[PDB]
Design a protein around this ligand. Sequence first.
Ligand code: SIA
Lengths: 160, 160, 160, 322, 322, 322
Amino acid sequence: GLFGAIAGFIEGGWTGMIDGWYGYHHQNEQGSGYAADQKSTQNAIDGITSKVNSVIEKMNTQFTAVGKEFNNLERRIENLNKKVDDGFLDVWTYNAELLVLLENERTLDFHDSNVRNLYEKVKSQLRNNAKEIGNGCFEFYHKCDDECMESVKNGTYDYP
Amino acid sequence: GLFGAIAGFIEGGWTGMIDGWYGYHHQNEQGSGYAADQKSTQNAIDGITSKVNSVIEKMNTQFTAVGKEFNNLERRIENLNKKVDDGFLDVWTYNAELLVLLENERTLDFHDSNVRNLYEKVKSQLRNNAKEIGNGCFEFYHKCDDECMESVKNGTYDYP
Amino acid sequence: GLFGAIAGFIEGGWTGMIDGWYGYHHQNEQGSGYAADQKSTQNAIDGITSKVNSVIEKMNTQFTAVGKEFNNLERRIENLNKKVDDGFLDVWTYNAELLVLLENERTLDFHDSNVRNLYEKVKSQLRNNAKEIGNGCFEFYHKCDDECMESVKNGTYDYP
Amino acid sequence: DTICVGYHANNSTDTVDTVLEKNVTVTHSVNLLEDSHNGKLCSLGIAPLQLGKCNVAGWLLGNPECDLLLTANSWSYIIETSNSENGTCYPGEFIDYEELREQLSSVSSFEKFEIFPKASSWPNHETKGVTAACSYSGASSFYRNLLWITKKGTSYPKLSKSYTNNKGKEVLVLWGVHHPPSVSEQQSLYQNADAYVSVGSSKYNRRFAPEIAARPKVRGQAGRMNYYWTLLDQGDTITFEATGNLIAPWYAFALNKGSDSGIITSDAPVHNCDTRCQTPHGALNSSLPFQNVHPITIGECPKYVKSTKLRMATGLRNVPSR
Amino acid sequence: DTICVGYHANNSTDTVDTVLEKNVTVTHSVNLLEDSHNGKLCSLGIAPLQLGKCNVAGWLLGNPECDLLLTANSWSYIIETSNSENGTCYPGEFIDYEELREQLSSVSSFEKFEIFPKASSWPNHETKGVTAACSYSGASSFYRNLLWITKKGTSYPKLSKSYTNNKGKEVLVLWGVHHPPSVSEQQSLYQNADAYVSVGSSKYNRRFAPEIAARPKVRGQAGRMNYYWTLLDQGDTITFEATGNLIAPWYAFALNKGSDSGIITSDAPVHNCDTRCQTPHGALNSSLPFQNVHPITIGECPKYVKSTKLRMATGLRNVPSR
Amino acid sequence: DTICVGYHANNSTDTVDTVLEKNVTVTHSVNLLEDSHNGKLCSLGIAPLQLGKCNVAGWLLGNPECDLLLTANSWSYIIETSNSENGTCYPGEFIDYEELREQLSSVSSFEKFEIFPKASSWPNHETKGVTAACSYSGASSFYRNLLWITKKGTSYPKLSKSYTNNKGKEVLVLWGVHHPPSVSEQQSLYQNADAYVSVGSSKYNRRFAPEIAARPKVRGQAGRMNYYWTLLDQGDTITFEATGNLIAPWYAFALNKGSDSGIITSDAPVHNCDTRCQTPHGALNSSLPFQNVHPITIGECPKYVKSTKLRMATGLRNVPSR
Ligand SMILES: CC(=O)N[C@H]1[C@H]([C@H](O)[C@H](O)CO)O[C@@](O)(C(=O)O)C[C@@H]1O
């Protein structure tokens, strides 16, 4: 919600858009329907994948036995051990909990940014050839056939 | 400052707006004055509260005695103990110092975002019915009575 | 790429702008050329410097001998020691790897934000006195001499 | 007509650090660092054991200077002060002492009882075992919980007494072994030059010989005394056999160990306040994640940290503009 | 004609936590927390040693109840169950036991051999050393790997046997020292009241005396037995000399220690599945960074954590708003 | 006419990793990871003690091969090389050795002095105590700091010497106890078959018996020697009594312990450079937070990390696209 698009000025999502994360709708006299934007979806899929790999795999791991056995005259060194185990417990629990919380915020905001950026890429091409009717929609002043919609999606629009 | 609103294109803050974090000013022939936007303020108050709770309370804590007593022929194990205590000191000091620094940056940027988003929610409603005079102000081309201001704040404006 | 400017709607960078991080181009009948925006460049240089100092220097460091020597009947306490050393290895490796990854994302986004913000500072001054021709460029409707460009860079433009 | 968008400002002088900028004034903040303490030593639900002029050794053994103490019922941790010297008054080594201190640091039931009554248990032997090293009100005395058994005029017969644990708790039994400085002093005390002390239970078996050796005087004594202990299990039976040198148990303790804890050394006053976290300088009223009061604590404590400020912004950048 | 910009939604009910907001429904997520286990005890490439009704001591010594066991070849860790009591059957102390357990927890080659054959090595001495404490099928017996050497009718001559290590591995040698309850029992077993046991190698030298002392009966025995061990280096030579009380080595073990490991206590079933990470309740199929299954593990393990949920968003905020 | 907004680019090939993207070229960066070392062993303000062909034991005891050494004044840490074998030349156990090494690893004042002069202190006894095990230039010798006291023709009288510490520092006193292989060798060396060695001070009391036992030859010796030590407090008085087997102190050391440190094992050259952080391969010029040079260090060190690259962007994404 940091970029005001997802759940913001674009009020809802499309369950109808099954082939990707971000995309377009469009309505013609030749029909209508959904289409994902491959470039940004694939970029996001790629970025988020690197993110998950980083969190999962940058974790270094040493072969360790952990358990220790001390007799009833070694209580002090038994408690040192407990202190170590408990210390790492506290460190890992906290930084794990907060790592997920923080990365989760960042991830959702990342998606929000991609939607706002995509919306702006369209707005920028169309300029005053369409009117921003709100909710992420542009209404063309001219007549926009299938080849022309394809150009807006391509990023090829070309018209003052 | 990441979203250029707080301390940016809206140059300063209002000590006159006492009933919330973000809001409006407005000026009529029926007078003028401040008013907080309850929705975003409450949303921010909620979000920031969750943030503080997370940092304060996700911290797990184990009953631990910490002190150890070793005799003058147990120096090695005494230093192991010192190594453990000192190690956690270094870990906690660093990740605490940087956690505050990082979250602080994020919090301020969050507030900045909320102001820009609010400013855009207005801009978007008014469209060409008012002129952006800068510093977060819109000057109406028509005549805007109390009920009408209330509509802009409501998000109900309704007029081409 | 979070603010869609660097590598986005401004497609490329200028190797020709040697005196700073962000800046302007401009083209006259008196010639053309690059110029860095000193305020934002210096602000970024300052911010990023503080960032690097924080990461490098908030790190607390204790005098420690680390090495321990245990005989062949002290195997348990030798492994406790190994557990401690290995535990901090895992902690420091992870939080270091992820700290660089996360701060790197944030740094690049910071630069992106500064370019978008600078672009908007210009857009805001010029208003309808120039046309947004895309790629970060504005084309004046009037005639813009050196003093006048200097005014836009100054933030002094002044004209409806 | 107009409408402006804008944000809050106030007279706040709260200042926080960010990653890009230092000393940034904000409208609202919270402190994350506990940096002050109680000034007092408190309870953990339960109150601490105060030893005052004594230490754990002196307390357990019954140093004559510790009579005005006995306050044991149950405790959450032990407190020793900088005035805690009266402990082992007859010079010697207290075996596995740090270990015993650790295991005794939190006890949930603790009652002293007469394991071997001075009167009835040692016929054929003595009871003039006192020393100027362990003196009360000027006169020579001895530990209240131990008995210095000596020869009854010219003869120290092999002694043998046993105890069966029926307290339904662990029983802590302490005893001593005397090491005379010379071979002739071994004679005048316990007659038998070839002497031994033997303790035995289900999980304890040791023999001791008198380590007769020339050494310097400590507290006016060239002799030494070694202190030993053990935790007698319920239903078990410890057994004492000796031909000399046995500083026998007089009182033992029946106890219920909770979970371990610690000993704090501090001259801070003890109060009835309650706390989840205790440090030597005072208790932490702590629900914050970090503290910089003291690294060595007992309880559920904020993480010790070397920071001096960890202020976390909750409000926005404060820009009042006058 | 219209073109709209928009984002995906679906019937997902996945829910994640963010820093600003809780319980946020998202279109896609991954779990970062391993929170379930195998139910089984597995291999680490190699299989674990199961002791079953025995424990390490009983196994090594040859407690008569452990005959139906001997399955040693090589193992990655030791498993003991809650039914693991038959170990030291004759009461006494197993010296440096926890240490031996740790060093024996993962062995890469392990073969039992007859160090000193019962038949040929002890002429001039006995072989009726059995006890009701160590009994098989009702009859009194003794450890299978140790020999209770006693006097041959009225005479216990100074015995002296040696062994040179030629296995090309370390050899683990165990032995015992008997402590009679009385001075007369010392007589009827080993004649010589003044008795000693002496073990010696390149890096091991110790002498033992019989600690004759009155003590309670454990498993019907008032006597005690102390168990000792050592790791004999390749080419080295351990030597045994005694005038009584020697519970001699009969079998020793030649081994190759890998790197250390651990012992797990668990009643979970052993299977042939393979794992990189083993916990007492089961194995973790773990490639995730964190787990909350169990703090005490063996292998390459995700970090133990006290969380109950660590779901990480990959998708966007889901608002199906149809 | 047209003004443009834009950003810097250059010929930089610096490459950093982000959370979303790998191998991203940027205009400016800094390294956070120290990944190289000095090649040298340095000082910590103060210089290290080099033992060279000796080790701590051989140095302290005065192994005859360590004469060309004595360079003690004060040091920040000890260095041993892979050529450090001449230490305990007469076979035996150095008691609490690792502990002594740790406590001696950094000393701020250290002076050798003659505690008991060979000439004057032992009338009634010998001084032909040498051995082929401890030889110099082919001939049989002995430790320079210890005296092998033997019987003066057919008689070893009970010896008794004392020392009072007046150095105004702690005094480190070492001594030995000889364990002959046979009962007859105990005779020809110290006459008295029943022999004892007794050391005693304010906080040290021990007795030793000759553990006469058959064992293998090490360095041609079947006998053994146990080495002991203690830290004599200022004003205290250690006392030696013996009837044989005492390998007496000849030289002791008066020292001032600083704070503890460590021992590094390395064949790297020692130089006069200065460092805050020392590793076995070399010193780290380190003011960076992390290093991957070596886990085992002495001093104020960057955190050891298993990374190979920790490059932190300071500049922007470098996009020349021309
Ligand atoms: C009497 C004496 O001080 N030293 C002698 C030792 C010791 O008798 C043995 O080391 C005891 O085990 O033996 C030698 O064969 C040796 O080391 O060359 C001759 C040497 O003179």
